[PDB]
Structure 1
Amino acid sequence: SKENLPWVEKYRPETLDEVYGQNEVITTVRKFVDEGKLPHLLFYGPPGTGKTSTIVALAREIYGKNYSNMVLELNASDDRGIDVVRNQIKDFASTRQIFSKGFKLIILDEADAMTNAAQNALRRVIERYTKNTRFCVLANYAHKLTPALLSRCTRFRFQPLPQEAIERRIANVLVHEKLKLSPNAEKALIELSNGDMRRVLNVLQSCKATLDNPDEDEISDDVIYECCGAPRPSDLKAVLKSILEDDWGTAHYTLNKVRSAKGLALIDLIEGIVKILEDYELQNEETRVHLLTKLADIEYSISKGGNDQIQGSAVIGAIKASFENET
């Protein structure tokens, strides 16, 4: 049953109408398939944008419910070498379908992990067998693909999911599940996503599990912040306030108790304070220069280890000395 799959897998789009966010490429692909001229596709984009779902729904719309038999889907999990190409891909392209009549589809998912020799052998397979089969290459990094292979396919860049589409998908999930979501909670959820539907679905399932109730209540910002993890905005602003206004020893004690009560990390607090202070309308940019320089130096030092207490005191002193120029 589908009620056992996680929310990332349960809500996988099955038709091209369930793929939100991508409109300029989805409409163009639909037109390509309806009019017949479907060229070799290269779906390039970040993880969680919906490239695999898009190509799966496309193959479903093209071949019907028997997609799993008329399409050759290869990925990084399968052995993709030069001999694998030579045998499997060439035998698939040269032959015809065993279930119906029509062009074939080879979905090379995650083809950014293929060997250079494999791509050099495949670039002439794409150019030779081009009247009975097509090629779809999915990629997250366009630098791992040879320029020869990169030039034979039409490139489609999957942009990160915008606010409207991600809110539409959130509303669809809240309709499918007996769940309610607060508006500010929804905004905070969209903020910590960066256009990644996987993260949204995962944390939505997790906060539904956090509810502890039969779901007669709503999901507020507190639930998301306590469940999604990472220094809560409350503790973040409390530490920032104690650093900016309170005394040195009191600020040290506050930072220590905050980072030791929930086991928070100093790097997460650093990034959070950087994100919060970005909205601060400040005086002459010298304070911002000092703050950014010292915080980046402390982050680079943390990225290699050291004393957490010394680095926390360094963060406190850096923020304080940077703000002392604003007077």
Structure 2
Amino acid sequence: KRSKENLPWVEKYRPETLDEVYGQNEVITTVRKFVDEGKLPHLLFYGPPGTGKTSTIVALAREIYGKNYSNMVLELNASDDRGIDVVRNQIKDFASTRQIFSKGFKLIILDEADAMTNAAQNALRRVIERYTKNTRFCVLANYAHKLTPALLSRCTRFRFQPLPQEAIERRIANVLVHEKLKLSPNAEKALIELSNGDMRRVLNVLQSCKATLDNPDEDEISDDVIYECCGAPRPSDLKAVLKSILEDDWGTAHYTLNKVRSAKGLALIDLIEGIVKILEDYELQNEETRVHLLTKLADIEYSISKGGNDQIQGSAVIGAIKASFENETK
């Protein structure tokens, strides 16, 4: 904990103010409007991993209370005990008592509330209803099916979308400026493609790419560096494998798959996922082809998830694709 430069990039680049949260303009604008006019309701933030929920709520707490927000809000997460007794005693005491420092309202942040038991959620209902005049609740979740309907009825919901491309590009530009790094356009495209809308993945991969350069001061990060550090297949490899499967005999396809995998030690799961993404754009005459492709590839993925024999699984992928595409003729 010497300096901020000894931290992982995911934590080192955590937004400190609402102005640094990207890709959530609608939610940020709405919550800022609520806070400015003192019309903050009970909030629920539902979204996938690494979209800015915790960052946004902490930034909102800073906006409301200032630099000393930590002593003016009650933050509980999955790493803490949040049983029914905790709800009855600690949350109830915090919600029904005035602030020690200031004279403002009180904020309770139940991060990862989807991990809370049903009994505690039920106990929270009357606590929320009874102390609304002076207390507000913020719930954060990735899975809404774990939240009781009663709790959902009492909260205003905001959905955090997967981060758009433009927000990721702007944050990457900021990180490159801070770190004195060069990123090629194709490298940025590949990084955004592999991120799948998660900023944490982008930051971790960028840190690994920087660590992979011999001389980061002048060396530039190319798509080759990204693929090498992440150990992911290149688009050319996927295209070649798919072409061999769809246009060559069994021996040639098997040899091509083995050679492509052994060239860089690729994983079969990555090849399957990339081929599925490519095939999703194909215009197929017969629906049976798509049905068989999806079912067989899902079965192969599930089997791979439990281990098994890699060679048999690869041959199964080849055979499944060939058999499914055999239906396009008639």
TM-score, with structure 2 as normaliser: 0.92
The answer to whether the 8 A contact 1:110-1:138 is kept is: yes
Q: Report deviation, 1:289.
A: 4.5
C-alpha distance in 2 between matches for 1:203 and 1:5: 15
Q: Report deviation, 1:133.
A: 1.5
Sort the Cα spacing of 1:221 and 1:214 in 2 relative to 1 into closer, same or farther, 3 A: closer
Q: Which moved more, 1:31-40 or 1:303-312?
A: 303-312
Corresponding residue number in structure 2 for 1:259? 261
Of 238, 245, 267, which residue of structure 1 is paired with 2:247?
A: 245
C-alpha distance in 2 between matches for 1:184 and 1:43: 34
Q: Which moved more, 1:43-52 or 1:309-318?
A: 309-318
The answer to whether the 8 A contact 1:242-1:251 is kept is: yes
Offset from partner CA, 1:22-81 (integer Å, 9 cap, x none) = 111111111111101111111111111101100101110111100111111111101111
The answer to whether the 8 A contact 2:181-2:216 is kept is: no
C-alpha distance in 2 between matches for 1:116 and 1:284: 47
Identity of aligned residues (%): 100
Give the secondary structure class of the aligned counterpart of 2:286.
coil
Q: Report deviation, 1:288.
A: 4.0
Q: Report deviation, 1:84.
A: 0.8
C-alpha distance in 1 between matches for 2:292 and 2:313: 16
The answer to whether the 8 A contact 2:83-2:117 is kept is: yes
C-alpha distance in 1 between matches for 2:132 and 2:289: 61
Sort the Cα spacing of 1:322 and 1:114 in 2 relative to 1 into closer, same or farther, 3 A: closer
Q: Report deviation, 1:310.
A: 2.4
Q: Report deviation, 1:266.
A: 2.4
Offset from partner CA, 1:129-158 (integer Å, 9 cap, x none) = 111211111111111111111111111111
Offset from partner CA, 1:154-178 (integer Å, 9 cap, x none) = 1111111111111111111111110
The answer to whether the 8 A contact 1:226-1:232 is kept is: no
Q: Report deviation, 1:301.
A: 4.1
Give the secondary structure class of the aligned counterpart of 1:325.
helix
Corresponding residue number in structure 2 for 1:76? 78
The answer to whether the 8 A contact 2:231-2:266 is kept is: no
Matched, 1:132 2:134: yes
Corresponding residue number in structure 2 for 1:53? 55
Sort the Cα spacing of 1:27 and 1:213 in 2 relative to 1 into closer, same or farther, 3 A: same
Sort the Cα spacing of 1:7 and 1:284 in 2 relative to 1 into closer, same or farther, 3 A: same
The answer to whether the 8 A contact 1:74-1:109 is kept is: yes
C-alpha distance in 2 between matches for 1:152 and 1:289: 42
Sort the Cα spacing of 1:301 and 1:66 in 2 relative to 1 into closer, same or farther, 3 A: closer
Give the secondary structure class of the aligned counterpart of 1:155.
strand
Offset from partner CA, 1:94-130 (integer Å, 9 cap, x none) = 1111111111111111111111111111111111111
Sort the Cα spacing of 1:117 and 1:182 in 2 relative to 1 into closer, same or farther, 3 A: same
Offset from partner CA, 1:217-260 (integer Å, 9 cap, x none) = 22111111221223333332332233234442232123223334
C-alpha distance in 2 between matches for 1:77 and 1:294: 40
Aligned length: 327
The answer to whether the 8 A contact 1:107-1:136 is kept is: yes
Q: Which moved more, 1:91-100 or 1:296-305?
A: 296-305
TM-score, with structure 1 as normaliser: 0.93
Corresponding residue number in structure 2 for 1:111? 113
Give the secondary structure class of the aligned counterpart of 1:192.
helix
